[PDB]
Amino acid sequence: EQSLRVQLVRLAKTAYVDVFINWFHIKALRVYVESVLRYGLPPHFNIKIIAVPPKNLSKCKSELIDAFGFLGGNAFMKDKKGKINKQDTSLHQYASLVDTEYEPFVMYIINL
Amino acid sequence: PTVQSLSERKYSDEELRQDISNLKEILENEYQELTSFDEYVAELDSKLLCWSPPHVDNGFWSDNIDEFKKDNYKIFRQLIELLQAKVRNGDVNAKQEKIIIQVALNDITHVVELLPESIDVLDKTGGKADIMELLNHSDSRVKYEALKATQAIIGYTFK
Amino acid sequence: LTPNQVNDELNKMQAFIRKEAEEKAKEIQLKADQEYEIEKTNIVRNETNNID
Amino acid sequence: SQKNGIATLLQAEKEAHEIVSKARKYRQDKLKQAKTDAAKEIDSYKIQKDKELKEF
Amino acid sequence: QRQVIFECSKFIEVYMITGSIRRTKVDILNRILWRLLRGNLIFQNFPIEVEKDCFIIFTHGETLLKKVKRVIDSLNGKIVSLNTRSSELVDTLNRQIDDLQRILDTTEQTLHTELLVIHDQLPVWSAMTKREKYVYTTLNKFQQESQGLIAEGWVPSTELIHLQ
Amino acid sequence: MATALYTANDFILISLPQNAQPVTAPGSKTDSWFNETLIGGRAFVSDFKIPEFKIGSLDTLIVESEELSKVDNQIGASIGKIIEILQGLNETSTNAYRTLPINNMPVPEYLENFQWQTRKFKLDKSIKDLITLISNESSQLDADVRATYANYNSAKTNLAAAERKKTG
Structure with missing residues (x-):
């Protein structure tokens, strides 16, 4: 048990950092891939990662949705503060799997 | 048909029953047990056509389709040619010519419903138009057969 | 949406179709230059053996 | 501008196909060229092998 | 199929898929295609006037075009690809609508000819069977002992001499 | 949060x-x-x-988005398991194992120099294989931590059982 215990705490810790870098890889690549696929020209994108001080995430997301959402579509920008999530039948769906409402502009939210 | 009906409604005396059963067997056996290809070729050639027990069966056609091919279903094509000929020459609704039409039309439905390639043959020969006229040509059995002849064609063109 | 919005997306459509095809077409012609040299060396080595 | 736009989109798709086909046309030609540009190296070796024979 | 051409030439006159669908499945097809293609579509619908509906998709791109069709053909949507003209298929399709409507007018005339000899005869054919089945149901209630049926049952005493 | x-x-x-x-x-x-x-x-x-990636076709692009989505949940899942195993062990801090600065360097700061990190991931490589490498790495790590814990939980049962045999 003792031998397993040292090995396990160390392994989890090393694993942690690695799994974290890989997660951030996927998200960065997933925003680039999405951006080219929906927008098209211009080839290069202006990408930023904005750190929100704690518990102001909602109000932040709303100020972005209202600012940039217009590019996606005139009717496709609705006011939302907090992640709206739908999963009821095929009349309401929200996910990258299937959707019938989403973010009008390309946005992923990262929380630890 | 008369014998078959009788078989259900038998008469008390045994001997009567024996005669009903023995006669029933010869008539039925005799027609089916002759080759399918033989019967079809024999009727079309002589130009005298009539429905018969194995001449109206689905199976008769199923076996005989492949055999027809010699110059793109040449025998079937001759039949469509016969249906076409009868209507134009000598008019229609003359006793002889009217018997043939109903039979010719029964034969063509089964073949068409069976193979989708038959659709080209109606169009090339020009049988497809002749059928549309036959709906309009008098007598209940004639318009009945024409409607069946048309519905089989339609199904493969447009589903 | 509005016809205008749907036309901005239309313009995007023919943009995509064209760009992935130029990208495809560069790879397609680059395999064709590797293939020219290689086929040319292979014809020659075979033949000099016959002449030998 | 609805059917004027569709026709541009339509043209866009032909231009894309032509771009792809052009690269395929290149390879086809390059296959004939490989035989052409190999035919010149071969017949220069053939007359050299005869030269050193005419010596023997 | 005529209406989804009439309502999709009009949409162009005002990578796309045109077809028919039942009206109760339009919203679920919209939601499934929106969850499959993340955005990336312009989905319309125009009611064909069972009730049905048309749809235009505009699958902006590739590599899912054979997968949108597995959504449409699963819930019984019939795509109508034209690829030639919206005025040349309409003639070849109206040359079949009337040609098949005349076969309707032939076979339904034959149907109403056949029903004339039957509608005035069904009270005889029905009333034969309603009492013939009633005869055999009662003949099942008898004995069949020694090549002769034994009918045991009740009769009032006033009607004994009437039976005898 | x-x-x-x-x-x-x-x-x-x-x-x-x-x-x-x-x-x-x-x-x-x-x-x-x-x-x-x-x-x-x-x-x-x-x-x-982050710079460009090679992209082969329009069809293939679509298929890329599919992979990015599933794997990303799978990796999120894998972090959920690792953190759950640390708490289980009774490793809790006020600044680790429930936040954990990436490599002992604050998290906003790590993202600021995350301009496409290279650990065996190359910006001139094909996109598809890189997606697979990242997902493979994590999965193997995930199996490792899980497998080791299983043996830890089992080992604890032997000690407990044995303590009653020596006095109980």
Whole structure:
């Protein structure tokens, strides 16, 4: 048990950092891939990662949705503060799997 | 048909029953047990056509389709040619010519419903138009057969 | 949406179709230059053996 | 501008196909060229092998 | 199929898929295609006037075009690809609508000819069977002992001499 | 959040055209808007522009998005398991194992120099295989931590059982 215990705490810790870098890889690549696929020209994108001080995430997301959402579509920008999530039948769906409402502009939210 | 009906409604005396059963067997056996290809070729050639027990069966056609091919279903094509000929020459609704039409039309439905390639043959020969006229040509059995002849064609063109 | 919005997306459509095809077409012609040299060396080595 | 736009989109798709086909046309030609540009190296070796024979 | 051409030439006159669908499945097809293609579509619908509906998709791109069709053909949507003209298929399709409507007018005339000899005869054919089945149901209630049926049952005493 | 951060912050990753503009308060440069306007100027904005990837076709692009989505949940899952195993062991800190600075370097700061990290991932490679490598790595790590814990839980049962045999 003792031998397993040292090995396990160390392994989890090393694993942690690695799994974290890989997660951030996927998200960065997933925003680039999405951006080219929906927008098209211009080839290069202006990408930023904005750190929100704690518990102001909602109000932040709303100020972005209202600012940039217009590019996606005139009717496709609705006011939302907090992640709206739908999963009821095929009349309401929200996910990258299937959707019938989403973010009008390309946005992923990262929380630890 | 008369014998078959009788078989259900038998008469008390045994001997009567024996005669009903023995006669029933010869008539039925005799027609089916002759080759399918033989019967079809024999009727079309002589130009005298009539429905018969194995001449109206689905199976008769199923076996005989492949055999027809010699110059793109040449025998079937001759039949469509016969249906076409009868209507134009000598008019229609003359006793002889009217018997043939109903039979010719029964034969063509089964073949068409069976193979989708038959659709080209109606169009090339020009049988497809002749059928549309036959709906309009008098007598209940004639318009009945024409409607069946048309519905089989339609199904493969447009589903 | 509005016809205008749907036309901005239309313009995007023919943009995509064209760009992935130029990208495809560069790879397609680059395999064709590797293939020219290689086929040319292979014809020659075979033949000099016959002449030998 | 609805059917004027569709026709541009339509043209866009032909231009894309032509771009792809052009690269395929290149390879086809390059296959004939490989035989052409190999035919010149071969017949220069053939007359050299005869030269050193005419010596023997 | 005529209406989804009439309502999709009009949409162009005002990578796309045109077809028919039942009206109760339009919203679920919209939601499934929106969850499959993340955005990336312009989905319309125009009611064909069972009730049905048309749809235009505009699958902006590739590599899912054979997968949108597995959504449409699963819930019984019939795509109508034209690829030639919206005025040349309409003639070849109206040359079949009337040609098949005349076969309707032939076979339904034959149907109403056949029903004339039957509608005035069904009270005889029905009333034969309603009492013939009633005869055999009662003949099942008898004995069949020694090549002769034994009918045991009740009769009032006033009607004994009437039976005898 | 207020306990699932202790030196981190929460992040929104967005991408816009370099032609995007805000309509919250017009006339402003996108870069200026993020700093000045977005929640009272408290917003810490960092660069995250990653270079091009090869892209083979239009069809294949679609298939890429599918992979990115599933794997990303799978990796999120895998972090959920690892953190659950540390708590289980009774490793809890006020600044680790429930936040954990990436490599003992604050989290906002790590993202600021995350400009496509290279650990065996190359910016001139094909996109598809890289997606697979990242997902393979994590999966193997996930099996390792899980497998070792299983043996830990089993081993504890032998000690417990045995303690009653020696006195109980």
